[PDB]
Amino acid sequence: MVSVINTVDTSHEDMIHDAQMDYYGIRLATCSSDRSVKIFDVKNGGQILIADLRGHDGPVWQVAWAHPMYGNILASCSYDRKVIIWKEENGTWEKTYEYTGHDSSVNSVCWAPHDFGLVLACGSSDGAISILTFTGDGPWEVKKISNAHTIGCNAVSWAPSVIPGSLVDQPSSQKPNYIKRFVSGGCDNLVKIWREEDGQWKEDQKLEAHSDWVRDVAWAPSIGLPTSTIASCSQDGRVYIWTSDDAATNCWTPKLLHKFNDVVWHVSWSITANILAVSGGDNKVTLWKESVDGQWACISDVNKGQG
Amino acid sequence: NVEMAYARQMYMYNEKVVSGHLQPSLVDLCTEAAERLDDKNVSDLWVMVKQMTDVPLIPASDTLKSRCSGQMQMAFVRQALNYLEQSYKNYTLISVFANLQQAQLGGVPGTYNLVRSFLNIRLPTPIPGLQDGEIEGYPVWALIYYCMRCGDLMAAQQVVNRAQHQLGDFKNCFQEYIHNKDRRLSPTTENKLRLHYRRAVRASTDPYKRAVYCIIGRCDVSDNHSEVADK
Amino acid sequence: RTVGTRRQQELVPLEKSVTHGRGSLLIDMGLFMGRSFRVGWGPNWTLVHNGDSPFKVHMEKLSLEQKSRELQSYLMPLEIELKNSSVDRSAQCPHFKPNAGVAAIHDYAGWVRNLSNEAGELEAVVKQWGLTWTLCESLWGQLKELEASLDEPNEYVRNLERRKAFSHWLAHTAEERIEEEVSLYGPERHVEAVFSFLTGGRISDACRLAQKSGDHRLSLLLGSQEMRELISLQLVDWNKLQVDHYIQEERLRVFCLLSGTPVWRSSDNRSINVCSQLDWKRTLAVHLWYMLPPTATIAQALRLYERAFQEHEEGEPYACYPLPPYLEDCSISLGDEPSAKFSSLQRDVCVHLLKLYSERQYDLCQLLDPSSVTPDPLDYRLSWHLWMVLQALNYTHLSEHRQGTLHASYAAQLENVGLWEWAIFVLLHIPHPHIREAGVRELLNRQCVVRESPESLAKENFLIHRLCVPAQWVHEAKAIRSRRDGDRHKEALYLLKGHQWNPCHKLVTRHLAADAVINENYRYLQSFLGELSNPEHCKHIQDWETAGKVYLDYIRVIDMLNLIQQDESSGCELEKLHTKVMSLCKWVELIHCYTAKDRLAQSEMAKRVANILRVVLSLQQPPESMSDSSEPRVPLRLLAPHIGRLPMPEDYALEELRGLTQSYLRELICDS
């Protein structure tokens, strides 16, 4: 589909479970069953391993870049029940924090919108979700949601930063009390929405449409529309698009995107075009876009091996 | 845009009325306008309006006397039950098609098999205390209840006929209930069913059995049966 | 050795079912589910994937594979659009709204009447858009017609004049493919080439063609009344009497065209269809000229033509279905299933526009589907400029969500190519002020550049002096752009022309002040601290008092000292230098260098300052030429008290304090 670009020999010894570009698209973080997190500085072509970060005792499942306003920070989560925060200072990568407050595998990590501060959500196979907060002064603060999912949490995704009433006149200097939300998917077949109220996290909604384990959840970035959109995928081979047209009604409507013949592993939103990337057990990556009639169409099918 | 879509229907309605043509159904014109707005809640609202307005229109001089007549009140409750039964049958269908691997729908069409496949989703673990046995591994009273909740009394009668040796006199009461146009027992059969309910069924550990007897026997109207009627 | 085995680096071919029943065990699924890939796409169309000597993962760019290069053309159109743009300035998020519903149809029709000068080379990349925009000009033109009215408009004249303009459009849409046809139908056929000449008139030359083989019938006729109705009655009568059982083959189709019937079940039981072998466009034109009076309206022409491809309870559907100008080739074979398929087909714009002429209710959510014009569900182009013209021609039934989506998609496209400020103009029309504000700030923080260049400065001057954007916001974006990666150099400068009533101070102090003292670069520090020292900025800066005073004073003292001394060493400034310096002793006393370098720099500065002070006092309190060599009999208690409260390392600072104490002891001995 797209013209062929650089090939990166990662020198790995196993399957890369997940990969994320940094905010400016100058670096690629990758993580594997080999227990390493590898960072590549692929600027203007030129594949370049710049760090091999070792600190996990098991397979690393997900990596998340923080917003560059806090410097070059990377989170990783693993089967070893740990979340590690890596920071680059003067071109040296170091472990700056380690969180061990989960009793089972930590399957997903997601940084909050930078407007909320330096906040990390972590979903675990112990069924809990932990919110790690860095205030600039002292240790990381931890708010743990115990029994968030009955069997295990597989995925976490933050809601976009929305200022309530952004079309209402306000003073030049003021603090915008953001509604902090995130979505989680679990092994109880539920997609759950969470809200911060009075410094505590509460379950705001349960979304029931999957018939087997929710594998991934992705909150669509705000494109300046009032409609909030979430994608979820599951072991049942379904992908759902959840829409909420009014933030006051909290009414979420599921629309079936597609049903694959195999498991769907990950869902990811394009920042600018509301395009959903869907990764299946069939070793395909499909791209989906909503048409003007509200129908979802597959706009590309990317097979392993056509590069 | 919504108000303009309806104002066009009011114009088209009034134009036909003024020209002395057959009066179009304002419900159908407004339903066709609602379907064009792509709002599901408004579409579901007009489907409900259409179902509840499909009653025998009596040209009464007095709308109050017509509305308060026992025949008209019974027609509204029949249409409300039909709406809720069709809505729940569609919910059961969508829930089964969303969970095909767990539901095990099989290849035989019909409400009986749809309800069995729905029970694999709603009752994945055997509930202790269910009574009068199982048909093909599914609880008899749960099958009867969800067939009735889908409005398919013939699918429920198929369950009752398969479990006839466990259900006893209930089969005869249920056959009388189906053959009545108003889904009513005779006062004699109803009083027999109510007496049986108070003596034996009220203390049953099976919540589906209790609910099915309370529906057919129109009794224990204080019980909400929240174990089986959660919405 | 030095050879190797040879690593099999395949993500294994296709073992599956074993591990699969193994996982059918539901006791664990997180390992089952390690195998595949949790990979998603990122911004600027950066695609991340894990799919395929080596064997591992490829990561191949994926922007737009269709129409990647096509600049010049949009440049002309977009310029035209924004030159026709209008500007609102009441909130810190400005608001664009098209100029009131006028001139855009003549801007677009004028623009394609320039692309026609070089459109020859392009094949099917403009004719579709040309058909649509010239249809929009014919229908809701609603523009100049050489004064269509020089004096006053009568709706009959206004509608007849629109039928002239749309008849000239229809003739021009047919004129090319008709001279292809007239090159092929060789000598001759008055039952074919005569028909095609009539499907696009130009009757002027249709007469010279009758000359050769055309009949009298046609040279005589080359506007009546029901004259043609009596032709019709004559036909009815042959019919009731079987008078036309033997007659010319499609000459009957031509005769029925002169008399509008226009589908005829003959006494042979033949369905003599006049309309077949045409497109819906010519089929509706045949209804507008030959089936109907020479005076009528278009909504009625449209609804009769729709109830002509739509069937009847006695009749074959006799008009062609209005397919888009591409899909025509694959007319779906309607095998016993026509309607259920029609309830899924797009219909090209021109009929949605001819309705919106007629009426105000039909769905803008169908009319703006970009696979009408093309079929790549990506680029809209036509959709955005058509939405601006539809907003100029009133019409407000479109949902806000679909506005936000259409603006987000065209802004995402513009970038896909890699564009800039006209995307800001398109966003400046969104009615939601904080979403207009947030989208423009986020897009600036993606794409703005901390190498300043003629291309950056062109986009920046366009943003400020055309789109009304600011100077400090771009600099703030550059500051973000540095912190996340570098540096120490441009970030300070870009933050400079950006108030940091707190952060600015923070940063400057903990870094630039220590290095500028080591290198003594007071000047470059003197701007930021001078600008922060304003009487309104001093009110708002945390720690302002403290540090402001501190550094400002260091630099000032040095300068004043030197200059004045030389100059002529005037007394009063010297009083105010004394006043500043005597207080500054008791301020250097309190430095809270909470960190290392903090203390590093503190020491550095104390040292340098002390050196400078020594040198300056050198010629300070008046060399006593008249006294027995300027003996310092006078002793200041305040200097000794300030030294005690002065805070620095116990080594060098206390050694200096001990030297001062020895000097004080010598002064006491002199007093004795």
Swiss-Prot record, chain B:
Plays a role in the nuclear pore complex (NPC) assembly and/or maintenance. This is Nuclear pore complex protein Nup93. Belongs to the nucleoporin interacting component (NIC) family. It comes from Xenopus laevis (African clawed frog). It is found in: Nucleus membrane; Nucleus, Nuclear pore complex.
